[PDB]
Design an enzyme around this catalytic site. Structure first.
Site, PDB file in Angstrom:
ATOM      1  NE  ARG A  32      10.301  -6.326  11.808  1.00  0.00           N
ATOM      2  CZ  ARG A  32       9.847  -5.164  11.344  1.00  0.00           C
ATOM      3  NH1 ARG A  32      10.333  -4.677  10.206  1.00  0.00           N
ATOM      4  NH2 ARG A  32       8.929  -4.479  12.015  1.00  0.00           N
ATOM      5  CG  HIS A  44      -0.372 -12.507   7.995  1.00  0.00           C
ATOM      6  ND1 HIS A  44       0.450 -11.475   7.596  1.00  0.00           N
ATOM      7  CD2 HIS A  44      -0.850 -13.069   6.861  1.00  0.00           C
ATOM      8  CE1 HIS A  44       0.462 -11.411   6.277  1.00  0.00           C
ATOM      9  NE2 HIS A  44      -0.314 -12.370   5.807  1.00  0.00           N
ATOM     10  CB  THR A  83       4.296 -15.489   4.018  1.00  0.00           C
ATOM     11  OG1 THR A  83       2.970 -14.958   4.141  1.00  0.00           O
ATOM     12  CG2 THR A  83       4.566 -16.423   5.190  1.00  0.00           C
ATOM     13  CE  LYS A 100      -1.635  -8.027 -20.947  1.00  0.00           C
ATOM     14  NZ  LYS A 100      -0.947  -8.671 -22.104  1.00  0.00           N
ATOM     15  CE  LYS A 124      -2.359 -11.018   0.379  1.00  0.00           C
ATOM     16  NZ  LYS A 124      -1.743 -10.185   1.474  1.00  0.00           N
TER      17      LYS A 124
END
Ligand code: SLU
Length: 522
Positions: free
Chosen positions: A210, A237, A335, A435, A510
């Site tokens: 990272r 997070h 994550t 669907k 989200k």
């Protein structure tokens, strides 16, 4: 296959030592440079320099070491974003103690699950989360010491980080003669993040990779003096944990906000002469017709980065036009893959796309039924492999095996494709897809017609599912007939509208096609 998108060579090389060793180095250098600021609290106009921050972290590392903390141990950091947040984080990485961030706003059962998995010996908590810890500490005899992060003195009976350091540090301790622990990078866990969630074990190595993307002037932010970032994302997070740790490597000024406000943010962008702003897609609402923007001097702002959830291409382009940026920089990660492994490469935009495979990685897209690797523009499950992939879920090898296959491919459960230029687009989460008959309907497409709104599917006995929505007014059949007359035949709102006060979203942007599933069923 050249149906595998590989990442290029790093424009900034991987580095030796553990992540704490790499960080002690970076920050000691800046400590010796007078006046460089690590953190700024825009809410209380308070700065804390790299000199102060290094001194307290080294001080607290040694203090934890003398307490008997080591590689057999976990600590939890349970806090809102704060200037104090990374003191225990950094302190532990320097001496190889595993750091398990615990969600600031977890309820008690979620907080019990998290710590049950992480099994902490010392718990760091803000004043705000203390009573939550105490209420669940009952069921967790592993916890032997509780420390208050944001108090100078003792707090309701508990030592604070400062008073704890005092009892365990020798006076005349020189912080610039402390040397961090060396140990196995791939073998020593640095962080345990949550996803009921599981503990994601991340060896030191994954943060060290990272630290290459962070300094990579094409995938990250080139080290350049007097750089100020304004971060709004949460530190417990992965999004905030690994962007922020990368900023400290770069010696940047991280101006943090503990809660987004329209005016404060725009204030601090101008005031702190900020070059890069780290947001989540939900906060793009406020900059629709944000009148404010036009007042301020946002000439220093070079980019705005989003992540953690989809950004509609429309609002993404809108917002970018308002700040006169070429577009929104974007990164995609889970994550379980430490940080972003798809990033918008500098000098290579593509609206809608989440970017290109970062260095060290490979991404691919597979058939849901046979697992065959798929070709250009073909939609299937997104799979990635590279050295930032977690070693496993803590104490849950079954779920580790269900996620990461023999060849190292992580199965993201996101549907996605790449194009002729190797740009990657994310349709939706697979379980978020509707669907209607055999025909597949993607929530994201319906919602941009409406725009607040959230699209999920009513489990019709007939069709299987029926493309439904929740609606936050700014009536129903006056919209379903608007829906049907924007889309085509299978995407017509065969499940209707159910108005709500607010659309169910997680702390990073989200939605919640599970809560929204339940919610529409009334
Ligand atoms: N950019 C994106 N676009 C669309 N969807 C996105 C997304 N990122 C995550 N998601 C979704 O959220 C899920 C991930 O959720 S998660 O488990 O909580 N983990 C994350 O969301 C996560 C872990 S690290 C990280 C990021 N790091 C960055 C560094 C720089 C930068 O410019 C942008 C980013 S985002 N994100 C994904 O599975 C996917 O469905």
């Amino acid at each position: 296959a050249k149906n595998i998108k590989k990442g290029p060579a790093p424009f900034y090389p991987l580095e030796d030592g553990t992540a704490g060793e790499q960080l002690h180095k970076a920050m000691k250098r800046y400590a010796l440079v007078p006046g460089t600021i690590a953190f700024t609290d825009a809410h209380i106009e308070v700065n804390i320099t790299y000199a102060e921050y290094f001194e307290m972290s080294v001080r607290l590392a040694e203090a934890m070491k003398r307490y008997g903390l080591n590689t057999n141990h976990r600590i939890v950091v349970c806090s809102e974003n704060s200037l104090q947040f990374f003191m225990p984080v950094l302190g532990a990485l320097f001496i190889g103690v595993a750091v398990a961030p615990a969600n600031d706003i977890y309820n008690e059962r979620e907080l019990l699950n998290s710590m049950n998995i992480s099994q902490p010996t010392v718990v760091f908590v803000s004043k705000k989360g203390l009573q939550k810890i105490l209420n669940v500490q009952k069921k967790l005899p592993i916890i032997q010491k509780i420390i208050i992060m944001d108090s100078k003195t003792d707090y309701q009976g508990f030592q604070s980080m400062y008073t704890f350091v005092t009892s365990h540090l020798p006076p005349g301790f020189n912080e610039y003669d402390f040397v961090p622990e060396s140990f196995d990078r791939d073998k020593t866990i640095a962080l345990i993040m949550n996803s009921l969630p599981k503990g994601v074990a991340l060896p030191h190595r994954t943060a060290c990779v990272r630290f290459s993307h962070a300094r990579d002037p094409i995938f990250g932010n080139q080290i350049i003096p007097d750089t100020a970032i304004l971060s709004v994302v949460p530190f417990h997070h992965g999004f905030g944990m690994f962007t922020t740790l990368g900023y400290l490597i770069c010696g940047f000024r991280v101006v943090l906000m503990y809660r987004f406000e329209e005016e404060l943010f725009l204030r601090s962008l101008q005031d702190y002469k900020i070059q890069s702003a780290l947001l989540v897609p939900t906060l793009f609402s406020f900059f629709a017709k944000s009148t404010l923007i036009d007042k301020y001097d946002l000439s220093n702002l070079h980019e705005i980065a989003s992540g953690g959830a989809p950004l509609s291409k429309e609002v993404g382009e809108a917002v970018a036009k308002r700040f006169h940026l070429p577009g929104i920089r974007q990164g995609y990660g889970l994550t379980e893959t430490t940080s972003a492994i798809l990033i918008t490469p500098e000098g290579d935009d593509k609206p809608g796309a989440v970017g290109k495979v970062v260095p060290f990685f490979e991404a691919k897209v597979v058939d849901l039924d046979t697992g065959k690797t798929l070709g250009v523009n073909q939609r299937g499950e997104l799979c990635v492999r590279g050295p930032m992939i977690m070693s496993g879920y803590v104490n849950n090898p079954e779920a580790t095996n269900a996620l990461i296959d023999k060849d190292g491919w992580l199965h993201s459960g996101d549907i996605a494709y790449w194009d002729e230029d190797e740009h990657f687009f994310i349709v939706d989460r697979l379980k978020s897809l509707i669907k209607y008959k055999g025909y597949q309907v993607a929530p994201a497409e319906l919602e941009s017609i409406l725009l607040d709104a959230g699209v999920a599917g009513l489990p019709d006995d007939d069709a299987g599912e029926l493309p439904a929505a929740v609606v936050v007014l700014e009536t129903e059949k006056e919209i379903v007939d608007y829906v049907a007359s924007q889309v085509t035949t299978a995407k017509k709102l065969r499940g209707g509208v159910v108005f709500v006060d607010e659309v169910p979203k997680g702390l990073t942007g989200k939605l919640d096609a599970r809560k929204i599933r339940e919610i529409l069923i009334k």
